[PDB]
Design goal:
Bound molecules: calcium ion
Subcellular location: Secreted; Cell surface; Cell membrane
CATH class: Alpha Beta
Protein name: Internalin B
Strand content: 5-15%
Organism: Listeria monocytogenes serotype 1/2a (strain EGD / Mackaness)
Radius of gyration: 19 Å
Strand order of the largest sheet: 3-4-5-6-7-8-9-10
CATH topology: Leucine-rich repeat, LRR (right-handed beta-alpha superhelix)
Structural class: mainly beta
Shape: elongated
Family: Belongs to the internalin family.
Largest sheet: 8 strands, parallel
Distance between the termini: 50 Å
Length: about 210
């Protein structure tokens, strides 16, 4: 939503680490400083990797954010991201995010990264058919059936998982970069129809 009157940063953003992030972003002197909706509207990018952030509550007041770098934090719930319709790049590596339902309405999201999140079920990704790059390395994924719906992908990383069947990748003609090392792949027939592959990693398969 939005704030109708000047309000302290710490009152909008409960997480102290995230409040500090917003304070630096808006170039304020203290998280106790008051900010307006106009100022929150000016934010189109948040760079907060390894910032010890546990919650991004309050981010719902930043309608124009398009880039969100939140790698290496302590995130679990990303419900606050649900209505950030303009999100184009979302990096959430090294967190513990498993509920991907909050991404369903991010129809402009083009790049999504969720490596090292202990994820196994990615069926929620079906709602992101426009996705162009996807990084899901170092998780516990085995079933990638859903990926057949992401026909716009040109870059996909599924390295260090537990995948055996990659037939779902067969129809992803736009794939240029595919990372599948450290999995359980034996059958490579699914790669017969891929004409645009430039990068392909299949080493260290444990069958
Ligand atoms: Ca600072």
């Amino acid at each position: 939503e939005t704030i109708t009157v000047s309000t302290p940063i710490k009152q909008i953003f409960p997480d102290a680490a995230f409040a500090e992030t917003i304070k630096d972003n808006l170039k304020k002197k203290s998280v106790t400083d008051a900010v307006t909706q106009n100022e929150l509207n000016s934010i189109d990018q948040i760079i907060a990797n390894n910032s010890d952030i546990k919650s991004v509550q309050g981010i719902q007041y930043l309608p124009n954010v398009t880039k969100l770098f939140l790698n290496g934090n302590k995130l679990t719930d990303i419900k606050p991201l649900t209505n950030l319709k303009n999100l184009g790049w979302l990096f959430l590596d090294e967190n513990k995010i498993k509920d991907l339902s909050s991404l369903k309405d991010l129809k402009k999201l083009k790049s999504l990264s969720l490596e090292h999140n202990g994820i196994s079920d990615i069926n929620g990704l079906v709602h992101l058919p426009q996705l162009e790059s996807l990084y899901l390395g170092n998780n516990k994924i085995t079933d990638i059936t859903v990926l057949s719906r992401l026909t716009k992908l040109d870059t996909l990383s599924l390295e260090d998982n537990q995948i055996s069947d990659i037939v779902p990748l067969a129809g992803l003609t736009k794939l240029q970069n595919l990372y599948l090392s450290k999995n359980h792949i034996s059958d490579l027939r699914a790669l017969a129809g891929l004409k645009n592959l430039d990068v392909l990693e299949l080493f260290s398969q444990e069958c």
